[PDB]
Amino acid sequence: LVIWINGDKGYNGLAEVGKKFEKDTVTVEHPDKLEEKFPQVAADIIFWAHDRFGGYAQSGLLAEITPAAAFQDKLYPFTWDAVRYNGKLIAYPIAVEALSLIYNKDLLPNPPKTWEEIPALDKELKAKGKSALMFNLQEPYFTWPLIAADGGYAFKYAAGKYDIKDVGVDNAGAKAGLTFLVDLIKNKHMNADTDYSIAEAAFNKGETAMTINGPWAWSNIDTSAVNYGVTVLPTFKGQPSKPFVGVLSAGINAASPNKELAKEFLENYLLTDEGLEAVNKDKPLGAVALKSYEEELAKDPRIAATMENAQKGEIMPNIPQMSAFWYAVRTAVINAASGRQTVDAALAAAQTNAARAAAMSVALASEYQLVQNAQLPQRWSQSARKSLAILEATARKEATAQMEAAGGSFCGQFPVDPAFKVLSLEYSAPNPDIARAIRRVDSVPNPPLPSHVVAIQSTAVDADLSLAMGVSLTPGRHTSYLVDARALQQSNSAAVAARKADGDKWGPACDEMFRGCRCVTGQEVVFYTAVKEPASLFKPSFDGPAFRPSWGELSGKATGVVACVLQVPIGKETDIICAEYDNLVSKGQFATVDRFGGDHTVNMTGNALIQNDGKAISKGYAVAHRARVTSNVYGKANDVSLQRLAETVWSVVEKRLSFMPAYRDLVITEQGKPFMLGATATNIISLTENQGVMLHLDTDDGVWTIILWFHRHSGIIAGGEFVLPSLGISFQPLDFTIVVFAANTIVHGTRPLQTTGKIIRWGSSHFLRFKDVNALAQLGAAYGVDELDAKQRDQLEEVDAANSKDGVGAARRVASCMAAERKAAIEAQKAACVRGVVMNPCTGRMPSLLFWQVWRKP
DNA sequence: CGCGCGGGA
DNA sequence: CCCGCGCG
Ligand SMILES: O=C1O[C@H]([C@@H](O)CO)C(O)=C1O
Ligand SMILES: [Fe+2]
């Protein structure tokens, strides 16, 4: 029973209830952004507003609650309606919150019962130098109660489901309400500038007679000198104003052992007057869903008003398409306050757009399911498998005779012997080409493979997986592995634990996992994970088409490619890649940053969009933007350089991994292609110089990431191993080692290194950072793709002029103003569902893996 | 090159 | 708050 709750609630009082529970037969925590973390991380009770829980129910991450009908009598009926998705109770209600009318008793002993009285009161109070009303007009959450009083709704509700095609923005009731709000602004009774902080400051300072706020504000008003009351929201045209109602709710996740135990704790250890009172003592709960305790609290007039307005209002829809509703209505109110549209114009356009975006979002969810379940172009067959197995077994004989003749196995000039683990190694730089791995210096006996990872012995199995997964490693000279998926997830967590435990660095616990990693230096390998058919981390569709594997242990499982290590023979391609890194470094095109605190120093290039730079309106880091304008030879030179670097590396990988192009084609949108680096799935490229990196999962990158290494100057490197602790392996990069791995789902790092001589190990990742490609596809939509270079040229000149006239603080004013315009442009395209990549709508990230292949052997 | 300013949130 | 940016 580990219960999550938001940090700003009463956790210590809940801990009291849980102590009183643990006795008769637990740990409450406050993780940052719980509402984003819980959606990704479920694969435990959770305390959060019901509106997210509807999305968790479409996501199946919440246990159906089965409360007794006598228990359901203990709480209010509308609270249970807030937690029932598709006719199934998704959680237990706790608290009820909604906006109320807050008023200063010394200016206003009798607050107005109707909105229509307010204009008359403002006249009088303006004569005294004060005002009738000040509330946040910037967010529709606050303005909607007035708008919807006379009719008008978000999405129509019937049969326990919201019709996303039936929006109520344009209804006559909504038109009258928005009209009354704008009339108040025109007569200077309110000013369309008024935000949360302004209105809060003006009320708590006695400068206005009323504001509109929820219970969170009560705590702040209590510190002021204001004698205030809290009452029902004014009626509009004799109608109750309808504030949205949020029910703080406790839910149980479908990935939980303790389900009937947790159900017992919630029913008769917290949802009691004793338990809710202990929490209310810690932090104020507001109104309560339990009828017994709500009658106690409502003795407080402020609490009675909160439940009053909550019952007079509408329960906030728990569907994700409410985001569309919110963006369209936010724009309608803003425009109709600033006279940028008529009330009737702004509500008509918001009705249209909100319904449009709700439609596209449901369409996008179904398109995403096809992405996740997509299959590689079928090249597997039993005949193909057999003929490929003959070719592989033959290449194994050819490779064995080549090893007898040469006296050992070799990667470039480096002696490969998997009996030894290479702890330090020497590189020679005989000439101006890349430094070459020549000698193993320090070693230990090579630790065995961990029990969850198996080397595939059969050439037939090697062929099965090669054809079905789109992997063709160097024939006769590779090792394929199979990793159980449950144990892979266990070990990923064990590795993150060790890193945390060490102080977010390489320390003893990370070193302990490393000591049991097996060396695959010099080797070319692929690790396939296998998912047993349920009868969590990864999401294979077991309804997909099934192949008959030759090995029975695959039957009833799905396979996917989590990691592959390549050894690139030095030649034309390594010359091209290394030359581009040298060109970009020499030309000052890398943006030096610190990563993971001060874990390491990385250099970045590629098609970033650093929104933090306000003048940034085109692809590239800020040096790139400048180079296109200031060059006196060719403005696109660095872009040609970046495209060739990404395409040469991509091509090298593609030859061995035929699924990579398939993945690129599957996840990059038409709108995203111009902002990828050439015809690859790479938009950002890193570069490290002799850096270790701590063990981590990359969360906001693509499905598969590429890392490559190369060397300059002679010397000796100790440490610097690349480690994949959940696959139970590590390796020293040699002449030109590349790893392609699923970084969303595979913990990885790089041990610290110590060097002798001038030797430099250059590490570089080629990855897909989806935020930059999405924002750039959005900028392209709003302004035109080919117009961004011209806009970026104008913004650089405008800022440089400002600096050279009025000082740097003028220049900063200009940059911040450009950021707001860029931001608004992006937000509009974002609201129209413009994306550069396809993303999981549930997780807000790219899928965990792709191209799952189901195997069955009847 | 250390450090303030800065954006999205 | 983080695989930026530009100023002293
Ligand atoms: O461990 C790592 O090494 C590379 C680094 O050399 C380039 O950034 C990187 O991406 C890490 O995840
Ligand atoms: Fe990484």
TL;DR of this structure?
One of its GO terms (biological process) is regulation of photosynthesis. The chain is an alpha+beta fold and 858 residues long.
Description:
Fe cation binds at residues 696, 698, 748. Belongs to the TET family. This is 5-methylcytosine-modifying enzyme 1. Its cofactor is Fe(2+). Keywords: Dioxygenase, Iron, Metal-binding, Nucleus, Oxidoreductase. The chain is 41% helix and 21% strand. The chain starts with a strand and ends with a strand. It is α+β, with helices and mostly antiparallel strands. Strands 21, 22, 24, 25, 26, 27, 28, 29, 31, 35, 38 and 39 form a twelve-stranded mixed beta sheet that branches. Strands 1, 2, 3, 6, 12, 13 and 14 form a seven-stranded mixed beta sheet that branches. Helix 15 packs antiparallel against helix 16 (343-372), helix 22 (622-630) packs across helix 26 and helix 26 (788-806) runs antiparallel to helix 27 (808-831). It is globular and about 100 Å long. The chain is built from 27 helices and 39 strands. Among the domains are: 2-97 and 246-314, 3-Layer(aba) Sandwich (D-Maltodextrin-Binding Protein, domain 2); 100-242 and 320-369, D-Maltodextrin-Binding Protein, domain 2, CATH 3.40.190.10; 382-499 and 508-572 and 694-746 and 761-766, no CATH class. It binds ascorbic acid and fe (ii) ion. The structure holds a DNA duplex (9 and 8 nucleotides).
